[PDB]
Design a protein around this ligand. Structure first.
Ligand SMILES: Oc1cccc(-c2ccccc2)c1O
Ligand SMILES: Oc1cccc(-c2ccccc2)c1O
Ligand SMILES: Oc1cccc(-c2ccccc2)c1O
Ligand SMILES: Oc1cccc(-c2ccccc2)c1O
Ligand SMILES: Oc1cccc(-c2ccccc2)c1O
Ligand SMILES: Oc1cccc(-c2ccccc2)c1O
Ligand SMILES: [Fe+2]
Ligand SMILES: [Fe+2]
Ligand SMILES: [Fe+2]
Ligand SMILES: [Fe+2]
Ligand SMILES: [Fe+2]
Ligand SMILES: [Fe+2]
Lengths: 288, 288, 288, 288, 288, 288
């Protein structure tokens, strides 16, 4: 099974706006480039987010990490047994992503996924944020989460759980209109309450948002003010019902894709109990 | 196996007396209604205790929780293999109990049991006690315990352990008369020393009492005074020999059914050793 | 100023009943005799309570401790300056009380007080309780407290505070009848919330009770059952409003003198704020 | 496998001397009798050591505890499979030992062993030591250890490990004469570094000693002085090389059987590494 | 699988220089001799490093520890199944190495390995360093690590992982020349991040260095000055990218073999993720 | 007032025996010489104990430390005001003792005292014990204590308290014969329960013993065995009634002067209460 979400690549219409957004607003460290992709760091990894030019204005790929070469081969076996098509990343791709091995596939609705092992770390170039942020919570919990839009949640659930080994944490009926809600399914693959959530939202993007977790409440408060100065805030500060992350949401430069910046959630383990919630926020998160 | 006791439903002759008892005396939060049942909360769950009108003046059903849908299906398999009749709760029942799935059955002596997963939580409506109580100990240990009256303890033991997966903690020979005792069997299914105890008592009720565990010793002391003002106390403060819960007992409005309100027990795990005790109280619990 | 209450001597009509009471019920260690006084230990001190025959059936003297010889001389100076009569204990008295020096005086209403330093300790004869009690809280807080009955609380307050150096913690209006209360004044001289309380009670004794503090809640619970078996309980378990001691009261063999046996209070310091309370118990302590 | 050593029974020529020894010297609580056996407590168990009259002046039986009835049946299966004779204790024996079930057998060299479950606990009669000892370390580690004398250590090892499930901790070559040593094998069955040790000593007793572990270093120091006053000391204070228990040894009233009274060892788990030691004491334990 | 590295034996041209180096510079305790080998201690073990005369000026053997006799037999089975030649150490060898059993074999490139159990400990002769060092970190992590030079890292990896049970922690591309690096593979067999590393270095020695871990940063700082006074320093203080050990390197008296003396690394477990690093030092370690 | 005891100088008939005793038995570090005095270290100070040849076979001087130059001048003022003769140590003496300033005087019975400030520390030559001892407890508590023999304890008390600023901790009536005891007075000048004790013993030495405090109980146990091998033990292990130091006593090479080697006492402060004890040992310390 997948151990954690390790990296995200975006294909965007405004690379300079994304550069400013990720550095001056979010606080990530600029880390050069690989091919036509600008790279950004959040920790010791050589990169965590890549931004390349493209008309998609969307998530172009997600990197799903396993712990060693044998684990990668076991994932290849799982894909074969499930009848899921995949190819082995060639040397050029391995060098581009800075990994020792990877499998390239797509989820049932077209999102490219890369299962990899052996990422590059550069502790001799210690992390230096571009904006005041004390650090990010990554480690065994990976880079953060994203909310994946899908046309058929049952079909998506079968793939992410049965093939990739994610596990359902809980469900929230997210209120859309007066008498309409969407049942969002929150999945874990480590202690992070959710790494991927699935929801049948009526938006034209592969994801609704990606989320980064900062070390302190002040990191979140300060980031809110930076994103507010940029005119990007989409939610007030709030705390989620299911994972108790205290966060806010803001627009990225790609229309309809947001970022969530948060702190302080609960973590999970083998004893997590599936439950259902009728709201996304225990408090706050008013849309603005 | 069952993971924890999640909810209790009572059918009672005096619904207003039970309402006052559960709120002003015990401290639970009134939480509206579902059908003809008044609902009461002790924590983040949408409800923990339900009270409906009925001549039984007794426990009408107990909700036994599992962690996910697959676990529920495994319980259905266990029931099938054991030859225990059950039905799947329909949509109306699921909506009434606020659960994602449930199996309806009875124990060997007629107590309706509901095995369920995916209960509703409402963190956006934070718990507010109706009387001064700092909170209840629930979580992975479930709502509390009850002592089930049975005509044949061996038969009841076989069902609760072999079919439902409870595990014997210990036995107390409860003194009844001069030369008479009843061997009460205390069973766990999580860290709570007992979730269900079985005893062959000569009372005309399905249960002897249900128990709630408060967060502090003062919660217990204050509750004693409230129940004393109500004229309901049946035991002085005391501490049990087996789980070291410090509690008192009081009458509910249903004759012969008591409530226990306690604090501070030991918890159990895979290393618990079966032992036998000759008294229910290490100290206190004098009957009044 | 007085540093702590160190010892108590009783003159009683039934020495054997007091012996049984202090050992088998309370748990103190029998420690031989000095003259016609039977001695009892609670800790490393050679003795803490003395019981001698006498018709008083009351507290015969209280030992008030200071830390060294110079402190004793300063107390002699305070007594002289205040015009309070005193004598210096002679060699025989010093040997009887096992102290290096002492001043003998009375409070304004006739209770003999002994101010002393240099008590005997016998760590080579480690404490061994006579009943199941894990130990007592003594140390810098002294042996416990007593509630002193006085005809004029203002006069008593002036003596205990201005002459002896006690400090007011708080006041409780203790309900006596329908429209009658007595303002009990609780005084400290160390971290123990009260060492002496003063009250104008209509009883024919020098004290209402003396109190010992045990190390654990179970010590208190077990002691309650022992005193109940002896037919001596006068209050149910409860917790005080002012010091948050969790205790019960019981009769000693001397009519109208009780003992309090408790656990777990708050302690005080230079920042304690005088406040007023309308009840002695936050919960419990129902009289029986 | 055996979970812990639970009880010991001795058959002795001088029952009064053993009574005084176990109470006034060691500190155990006298706990009545069962049949012709005097009982002694160290904790919440109804009894831990039994003393009956007999010419053996030796260990008459050892009680080996398992956690439940099913575990006892699994032990019966192991005995059957190994060809080890055993009988099931009858009702009279169960009542005598205060257990819910037991198997009676002998080790290869004649020591009666009793494998049992469901011992009696009496928390309503809290432990009260007969001499100043703060308490004993028992719990999941059982009552202590004994060193079993055997004529063939390999044969004894095969039985205790393969049949009963004990596990070798380490070996000490115990110096006997100038060029002679005995390889003592120390076995665990829980966190206690050793519960049984095997050694081919030239003594005419079934055991060399039994050992009790007290809670504090002072407990050990005080006990040394009591046993010295009794003229029973056989070793000065010392600390063992293998388990780092700080203890002393003394004679029991049965010739050639000693007691060890100790504190503060290391505990073990699945990661313990077998090692060999050339001395029993890292320091101390000089024979006197 | 191998549990830890337990001992190292060197065959050297200058035994007195090695003696001075290990004692006065490194701080090990001289511990007599066994045959023609001088022995040195770092802890409770009778010996950890042996130095014998020989023209090799290299590591002569490495002792790989398992926890018990059965584990040794399982290793013999693994060797047999893998077609790896081995012999059982005879009594003379067992006595020389002070072990209860051992298997003698070589790795694929000629380094003698000894798999053993039951080493001698001498707690009655407590460790006394020869130079100011507070102690070494050994225990379950073994004596330290060594970096093994091999002509074919893949072949060496297959042996150390598949046969001996070591597990890959991570890889560092160690820069050699302008456009040349060697991929060093770091292997664990316990919590120590690496016990053996494999690298295809162009040196004529079996190992590049061995490493000892001291308890404090000051131990490392003081040792640096001692080795500097001896003219042996080869690296400044630094900290590694992969295990975060803070250390320095120095020459041993055998040309081309160094010692590493360090403190304060991260430890590993089943959750360690394979990663790749482009530098050996996060900071420092400049070669001098 | 004096802040702590900093150093001791002995004048002895057998300098080599004292050298072996202090290093191989006690564990102190040899630290060269100053004039005709051999120096020994216990910590970062350039020296703590000096040994010079002399027929006295006794303590030749004691160094009493203050914190700065102004404090030394205040001590000179106290001496002047008390009429106590003193001289200022000259440059040669300052260089010999490695201090920035000192006053030379004697106590009322002839013991030379040196009050000093600004001692030399040599952290670049870290402490290295000569025998297995983990370290000594010194710091603000100074080097240890000594018991000073005096012909008139009242006179000695007046000097040590009124002139030097020591403070009485407690008194022990030390049993000498059948109906004879000596009241030993234990004095502190920092958190060490006693730095100097005064007693009217009938011995022909200035002191009865000096004491060093080691960091661990094992340090004490191991030291006992070393001193026993040397034939010097004078007491078994024991623990004191007043300071709860766990120690043993042994003979130094100077007849009638002993050393005490201990661990783990209580410390004192402004709240210490004077008490009296009838024994020196709570347990142990049997004379041998
Ligand atoms: O991390 C999260 C936890 C709970 C809910 C959301 C969410 C809210 C609105 C739309 C989509 C998801 C979320 O992001
Ligand atoms: O929680 C508990 C623990 C031990 C005994 C009882 C009990 C006492 C009297 C009657 C029935 C049960 C209990 O409720
Ligand atoms: O310790 C105490 C704290 C508060 C009240 C009392 C008290 C109650 C009734 C009568 C007298 C005193 C007391 O004893
Ligand atoms: O607990 C123990 C640990 C180590 C050795 C012994 C021992 C010593 C002498 C004779 C027999 C055993 C022991 O009792
Ligand atoms: O412990 C270690 C951790 C990381 C790298 C090295 C290393 C550096 C240079 C040459 C060989 C190995 C090392 O020793
Ligand atoms: O540190 C100490 C504490 C208490 C007593 C002594 C003592 C015992 C015998 C003779 C002199 C002193 C001592 O040294
Ligand atoms: Fe989110
Ligand atoms: Fe109950
Ligand atoms: Fe009171
Ligand atoms: Fe033993
Ligand atoms: Fe290294
Ligand atoms: Fe001393």
């Amino acid at each position: 099974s997948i151990e954690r979400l390790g990296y995200l690549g975006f294909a965007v219409k405004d690379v300079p706006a994304w550069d400013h957004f990720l550095t001056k607003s979010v606080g990530l460290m600029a880390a050069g480039s690989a091919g036509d992709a600008a790279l950004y760091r959040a920790d010791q990894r050589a990169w965590r987010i890549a931004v390349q030019p493209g008309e998609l204005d969307d998530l172009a790929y997600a990197g799903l990490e396993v712990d060693d070469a044998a684990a990668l081969e076991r994932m290849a076996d799982k894909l074969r047994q499930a009848g899921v098509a995949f190819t082995r990343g060639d040397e050029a791709l391995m060098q581009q992503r800075k990994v020792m091995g990877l499998l390239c596939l797509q989820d049932p609705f077209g999102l490219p996924l890369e299962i990899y092992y052996g990422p590059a770390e550069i502790f001799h170039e210690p992390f230096l944020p571009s904006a005041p942020v004390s650090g990010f919570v990554t480690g065994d919990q990976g880079i953060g989460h994203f909310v994946r839009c899908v046309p058929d949640t049952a079909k998506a659930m079968a793939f992410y759980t049965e093939v990739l080994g994610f596990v359902l944490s809980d469900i929230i009926d997210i209120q859309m209109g007066p008498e309409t809600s969407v049942p969002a399914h929150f999945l874990h693959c480590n202690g992070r309450h959710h790494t991927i959530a699935l929801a049948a939202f009526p938006i034209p993007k592969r994801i609704h948002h990606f989320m980064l977790q900062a070390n302190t409440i002040d990191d979140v408060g300060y980031a809110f003010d930076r994103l507010d100065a940029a005119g990007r805030i989409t939610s007030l500060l709030g705390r989620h019902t299911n994972d108790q992350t205290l966060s806010f949401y803001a627009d990225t430069p790609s229309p309809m894709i947001e970022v969530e910046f948060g702190w302080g959630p609960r973590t999970v383990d083998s004893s997590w109990t599936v439950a259902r919630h009728s709201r996304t926020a225990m408090w706050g998160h008013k849309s603005v």
